[PDB]
Design a protein around this nucleic acid. Structure first.
Ligand SMILES: [Mg+2]
Ligand SMILES: [Mg+2]
Ligand SMILES: [Mg+2]
Ligand SMILES: [Mg+2]
Ligand SMILES: [Mg+2]
Ligand SMILES: [Mg+2]
Ligand SMILES: [Mg+2]
Ligand SMILES: [Mg+2]
Ligand SMILES: [Mg+2]
Ligand SMILES: [Mg+2]
Ligand SMILES: [Mg+2]
Ligand SMILES: [Mg+2]
Ligand SMILES: [Mg+2]
Ligand SMILES: [Mg+2]
Ligand SMILES: [Mg+2]
Ligand SMILES: [Mg+2]
Ligand SMILES: [Mg+2]
Ligand SMILES: [Mg+2]
Ligand SMILES: [Mg+2]
Ligand SMILES: [Mg+2]
Ligand SMILES: [Mg+2]
Ligand SMILES: [Mg+2]
Ligand SMILES: [Mg+2]
Ligand SMILES: [Mg+2]
Ligand SMILES: [Mg+2]
Ligand SMILES: [Mg+2]
Ligand SMILES: [Mg+2]
Ligand SMILES: [Mg+2]
Ligand SMILES: [Mg+2]
Ligand SMILES: [Mg+2]
Ligand SMILES: [Mg+2]
Ligand SMILES: [Mg+2]
Ligand SMILES: [Mg+2]
Ligand SMILES: [Mg+2]
Ligand SMILES: [Mg+2]
Ligand SMILES: [Mg+2]
Ligand SMILES: [Mg+2]
Ligand SMILES: [Mg+2]
Ligand SMILES: [Mg+2]
Ligand SMILES: [Mg+2]
Ligand SMILES: [Mg+2]
Ligand SMILES: [Mg+2]
Ligand SMILES: [Mg+2]
Ligand SMILES: [Mg+2]
Ligand SMILES: [Mg+2]
Ligand SMILES: [Mg+2]
Ligand SMILES: [Mg+2]
Ligand SMILES: [Mg+2]
Ligand SMILES: [Mg+2]
Ligand SMILES: [Mg+2]
Ligand SMILES: [Mg+2]
Ligand SMILES: [Mg+2]
Ligand SMILES: [Mg+2]
Ligand SMILES: [Mg+2]
Ligand SMILES: [Mg+2]
Ligand SMILES: [Mg+2]
Ligand SMILES: [Mg+2]
Ligand SMILES: [Mg+2]
Ligand SMILES: [Mg+2]
Ligand SMILES: [Mg+2]
Ligand SMILES: [Mg+2]
Ligand SMILES: [Mg+2]
Ligand SMILES: [Mg+2]
Ligand SMILES: [Mg+2]
Ligand SMILES: [Mg+2]
Ligand SMILES: [Mg+2]
Ligand SMILES: [Mg+2]
Ligand SMILES: [Mg+2]
Ligand SMILES: [Mg+2]
Ligand SMILES: [Mg+2]
Ligand SMILES: [Mg+2]
Ligand SMILES: [Mg+2]
Ligand SMILES: [Mg+2]
Ligand SMILES: [Mg+2]
Ligand SMILES: [Mg+2]
Ligand SMILES: [Mg+2]
Ligand SMILES: [Mg+2]
Ligand SMILES: [Mg+2]
Ligand SMILES: [Mg+2]
Ligand SMILES: [Mg+2]
Ligand SMILES: [Mg+2]
Ligand SMILES: [Mg+2]
Ligand SMILES: [Mg+2]
Ligand SMILES: [Mg+2]
Ligand SMILES: [Mg+2]
Ligand SMILES: [Mg+2]
Ligand SMILES: [Mg+2]
Ligand SMILES: [Mg+2]
Ligand SMILES: [Mg+2]
Ligand SMILES: [Mg+2]
Ligand SMILES: [Mg+2]
Ligand SMILES: [Mg+2]
Ligand SMILES: [Mg+2]
Ligand SMILES: [Mg+2]
Ligand SMILES: [Mg+2]
Ligand SMILES: [Mg+2]
Ligand SMILES: [Mg+2]
Ligand SMILES: [Mg+2]
Ligand SMILES: [Mg+2]
Ligand SMILES: [Mg+2]
Ligand SMILES: [Mg+2]
Ligand SMILES: [Mg+2]
Ligand SMILES: [Mg+2]
Ligand SMILES: [Mg+2]
Lengths: 92, 50, 88, 100
RNA sequence: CCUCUAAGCACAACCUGCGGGAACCCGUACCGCAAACCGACACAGGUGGGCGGGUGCAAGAGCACUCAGGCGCGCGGGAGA
RNA sequence: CGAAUGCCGGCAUGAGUAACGAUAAAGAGGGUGAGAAUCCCUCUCGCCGUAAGCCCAAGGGUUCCUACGCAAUGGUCGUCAGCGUAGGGUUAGGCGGGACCUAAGGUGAAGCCGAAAGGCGUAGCCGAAGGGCAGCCGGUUAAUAUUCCGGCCCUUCCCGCA
RNA sequence: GAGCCGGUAGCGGGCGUGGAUCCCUGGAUGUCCGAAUGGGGGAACCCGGCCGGCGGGAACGCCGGUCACCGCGCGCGCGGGGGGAACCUGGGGAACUGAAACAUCUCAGUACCCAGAGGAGAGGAAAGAGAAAUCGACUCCCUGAGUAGCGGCGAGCGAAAGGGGACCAGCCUAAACCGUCCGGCUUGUCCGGGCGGGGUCGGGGGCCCUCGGCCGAAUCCCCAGCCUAGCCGAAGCUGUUGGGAAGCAGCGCCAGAGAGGGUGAAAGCCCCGUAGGCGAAAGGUGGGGGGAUAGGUGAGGGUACCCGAGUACCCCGUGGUUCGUGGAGCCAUGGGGGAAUCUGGGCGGACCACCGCCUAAGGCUAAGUACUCCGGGUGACCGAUAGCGCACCAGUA
């Protein structure tokens, strides 16, 4: 239960700007969802993560009913200055 | 730990698949990502003896 | 009220009357309201060590029968449970 | 459950309609709509696509379901409903009698 | 927070600096005297706190104008009963 | 079924009639577009300016922003919108709450009393825009920013040394 | 047993006659809330302690256990807590109504609230019923009967016996006495306390010497059978108008199957089916069938030992029953007085005396009966304003 935390990254024009300072915001498992997922991202991408932030996003939708997917937590690593690696630079 | 360190490996594999899915590069979805029926619960089943 | 060795209180009617009464002349009734006859209750105090009951006071000799005993056990501090469950 | 029926992907006569009596091939069972497709109803689909690819040449457009209570199966016979012969370990579909 | 001793510990425990480390959960958008709140309405109503400029009139959160900022009030055009 | 100021649905009439929701006020030139008084820009005009401007709580919840739209909702039209579709967007050791405290009031071991539901009630606990606690200034995208980043500072804890 | 990856239609992506999809049965995982139960909480969230695990780490983290409260026995352990459409018992319990007003009354011990409990509940083995040298647990249905009655003798309410049925069954406990044992004391050849052994109208029992003696559970393992998936299941081809045939016609056939549905319409013979008959590894289920266990076998005659205590009985107050104070018994019991244990005690409708009946103050006890969220079939039941409020994404907007 360490790779069932970091669910997915987000391709987005804001989290392509995370590669200039602080590595990319992932959608994380929104419960069991601590900001100490530093030992869920550095145990997954073999880095040394300094700082993590946290969120809660993604509301409603029409077509007969509500809650577009989920309301998944998503944030990032402000991983040490150039252990920023692990082929992510694809698409952005 | 007779069955562990294998689902750590396969959950590592599914967080290669869910990486590959978000960028537009996952072209065998159900042929791969529904491994977790027979695979992955392949070795998440033992009787907890003792 | 309570019970401690007996059954709880009952519910009565009242049944007023305003009459002469059969063995004299014509009778009647008036108004059937609910008197609520709470049973006779007396806090009795016995010296098992300091024990207190709400006993029915037609059952004060019964609780002294319950006290005229030696049920083989010392003090946990409160103990009317062993006095009331070793009742007959 | 109820959704199982006459036969499976083999050759089969249809005794339905315009195609009252036509021996079609392997039939490609539907069957939640209780049909097959087999070889009979060949009605033209006046559709482009959902994905706009290789545009309209001619229409040799494909078949139709053909409700499966009229596809009479075949063997060295004609029609003759299927039956079950078990032989102590199996469950085979033997027709009104020829064989097979 | 400051302090005093009980229990206890006086090989601990606090205190002061210097080195490293760790700092979790939720909220955070937007409207917020309103077209997004409450009044079935993009309703002339209601709504708590803070800043609320300048000059003038005795003063002022007044009033008159006007910065910054924000609107012309989501039907108009005529005519001149 | 013809009646019940019947019931439900429909469609009339009233009627292209009253209104269109402030007597703050508009006018023009370019665009864009199939289409424009209404959308965008420009230049005047006006109106608030102890607000009709900013900021925060309450509340509402994605209305925010961008792109594709305009059937529907906008009392007109609408390319516009807060409306539809999809995609982004809400980053905190320091701001506000909780790993702190209590007030009224709840809850409530003990204890009391009630036919049962339960009603009280000490300690305790809960209880908040009250106390306590460590942050200021600037920039950045389309959106966030006391959160991101830049500078300077500060707080708790834990370990080590003195 | 050949198609699937739910209501897929679309990415095309795979997967299956070495057995998938499905359906059933048994596990596993069951986040969080909820009786919620570690504490808090404004439910679906926060905040912990202890143990065990990952600079992943001593601090914050996360994982996996365990941490509520109450009841029962010896810190230790087994239950309870809440839910359920109705059904039922107990505790409470109206009022509109009806009386053509209304108060007694009726509505009604209805609705409703609370507690409890389970597939049923209740009640239940006689201190019964009441006219018979009688019936013999309790419940339900029909009769009795709108009778007897009650009743401002108004309105109305309204049994019970008997008799038909269903069903069937009786049992445990101090109907005393002997030993046991923490201690009680005035060490008593003994007070009550727990068990144990006795004990249930060769009228009962205990105790005292003749005459010696196994029926059968409600309890337990079994086994059919029942479900919870299913399966095999008879026999029709041609021509015809037609979009289409099963319609029409000819020549047939099955029938323990001519119930129904769908099939391009009107199909016994195309399909699904039906009649009939198979099927359970796994779980529930169940003496319906046989098996054992637990228990049961002062017949006699005596020395007046024991037959359930603040109880019976009496009065005051009431409820229940047909019973509203009446001539008021009985059954319950809130107050007060307050006994005896078979020459006892209650009842037979004030009461009294004869004659009877029956054993209270301890408990359990299947079965038949009510019910219908549930599953199935059945309809001189509805066919979208009907039928449930919902045939549809409805207790939704
Ligand atoms: Mg945050
Ligand atoms: Mg929206
Ligand atoms: Mg009278
Ligand atoms: Mg009355
Ligand atoms: Mg006293
Ligand atoms: Mg097989
Ligand atoms: Mg740190
Ligand atoms: Mg803001
Ligand atoms: Mg304000
Ligand atoms: Mg506005
Ligand atoms: Mg509103
Ligand atoms: Mg209004
Ligand atoms: Mg408006
Ligand atoms: Mg307004
Ligand atoms: Mg005000
Ligand atoms: Mg002045
Ligand atoms: Mg003014
Ligand atoms: Mg207007
Ligand atoms: Mg004028
Ligand atoms: Mg009409
Ligand atoms: Mg009329
Ligand atoms: Mg008429
Ligand atoms: Mg109408
Ligand atoms: Mg009209
Ligand atoms: Mg007019
Ligand atoms: Mg006019
Ligand atoms: Mg007008
Ligand atoms: Mg003016
Ligand atoms: Mg002005
Ligand atoms: Mg916008
Ligand atoms: Mg239109
Ligand atoms: Mg419009
Ligand atoms: Mg355009
Ligand atoms: Mg929008
Ligand atoms: Mg800080
Ligand atoms: Mg703070
Ligand atoms: Mg915490
Ligand atoms: Mg607190
Ligand atoms: Mg207080
Ligand atoms: Mg209270
Ligand atoms: Mg507490
Ligand atoms: Mg505070
Ligand atoms: Mg404060
Ligand atoms: Mg903003
Ligand atoms: Mg902000
Ligand atoms: Mg400073
Ligand atoms: Mg699917
Ligand atoms: Mg299988
Ligand atoms: Mg399978
Ligand atoms: Mg399945
Ligand atoms: Mg697990
Ligand atoms: Mg809890
Ligand atoms: Mg609590
Ligand atoms: Mg919470
Ligand atoms: Mg290690
Ligand atoms: Mg370690
Ligand atoms: Mg825990
Ligand atoms: Mg047991
Ligand atoms: Mg309960
Ligand atoms: Mg009345
Ligand atoms: Mg009346
Ligand atoms: Mg009246
Ligand atoms: Mg009555
Ligand atoms: Mg029963
Ligand atoms: Mg009973
Ligand atoms: Mg008897
Ligand atoms: Mg009767
Ligand atoms: Mg009878
Ligand atoms: Mg009888
Ligand atoms: Mg019998
Ligand atoms: Mg003794
Ligand atoms: Mg005995
Ligand atoms: Mg003898
Ligand atoms: Mg057997
Ligand atoms: Mg058998
Ligand atoms: Mg079956
Ligand atoms: Mg068959
Ligand atoms: Mg057949
Ligand atoms: Mg024809
Ligand atoms: Mg038919
Ligand atoms: Mg037709
Ligand atoms: Mg037919
Ligand atoms: Mg059969
Ligand atoms: Mg079995
Ligand atoms: Mg078996
Ligand atoms: Mg059973
Ligand atoms: Mg007796
Ligand atoms: Mg007495
Ligand atoms: Mg008597
Ligand atoms: Mg009389
Ligand atoms: Mg006698
Ligand atoms: Mg008697
Ligand atoms: Mg009698
Ligand atoms: Mg008597
Ligand atoms: Mg008599
Ligand atoms: Mg029973
Ligand atoms: Mg019955
Ligand atoms: Mg059905
Ligand atoms: Mg009909
Ligand atoms: Mg019909
Ligand atoms: Mg309808
Ligand atoms: Mg309807
Ligand atoms: Mg219709
Ligand atoms: Mg619905």
């Amino acid at each position: 239960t360490a790779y069932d935390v970091i669910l997915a990254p987000v391709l987005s024009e804001k989290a392509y700007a995370g590669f200039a300072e602080g590595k990319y915001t992932f959608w994380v498992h929104p419960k069991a969802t601590k900001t100490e997922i530093k030992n869920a991202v550095e145990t997954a991408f073999k880095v040394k993560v300094v700082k993590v932030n946290t969120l809660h996003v993604r509301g409603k939708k029409k077509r007969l009913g509500r809650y577009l997917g989920k309301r998944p937590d998503r944030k990032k690593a402000i991983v040490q200055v150039a252990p920023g690696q692990k082929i992510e630079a694809l698409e952005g | 730990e007779a069955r562990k360190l294998s689902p750590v490996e396969l959950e590592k594999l599914v967080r290669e698949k869910k990486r590959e899915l978000m960028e537009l590069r996952f072209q065998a979805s159900i042929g791969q990502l529904s491994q977790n029926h027979k695979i992955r619960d392949l070795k998440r089943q033992i009787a907890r003896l003792l | 009220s309570g019970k401690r060795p007996i059954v709880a209180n009952s519910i009565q009617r009242r049944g007023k009357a305003k009459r002469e009464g059969g063995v004299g002349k014509k009778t009647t009734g008036i108004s059937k309201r609910r008197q609520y006859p709470n049973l006779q209750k007396v806090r009795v105090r016995v010296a098992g060590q300091e024990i207190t009951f709400r006993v029915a006071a037609s059952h004060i000799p019964k609780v002294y029968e319950l006290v005229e005993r030696a049920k083989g056990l010392k003090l946990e501090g409160l103990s009317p449970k062993e006095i009331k469950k070793e009742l007959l | 459950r109820v959704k199982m029926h006459v036969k499976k992907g083999d050759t089969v006569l249809v005794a339905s309609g315009k195609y009252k009596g036509r021996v079609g091939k392997v039939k490609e069972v539907l069957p939640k709509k209780y049909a097959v497709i087999v070889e009979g109803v060949n009605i033209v689909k006046k559709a482009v696509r959902v994905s706009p690819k290789y545009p309209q040449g001619g229409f040799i457009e494909k078949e139709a379901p053909l409700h499966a209570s009229k596809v009479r199966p075949i063997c060295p016979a004609c029609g003759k409903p299927t039956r079950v012969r078990k032989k102590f370990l199996e469950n085979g579909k033997k027709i009104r009698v020829c064989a097979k």
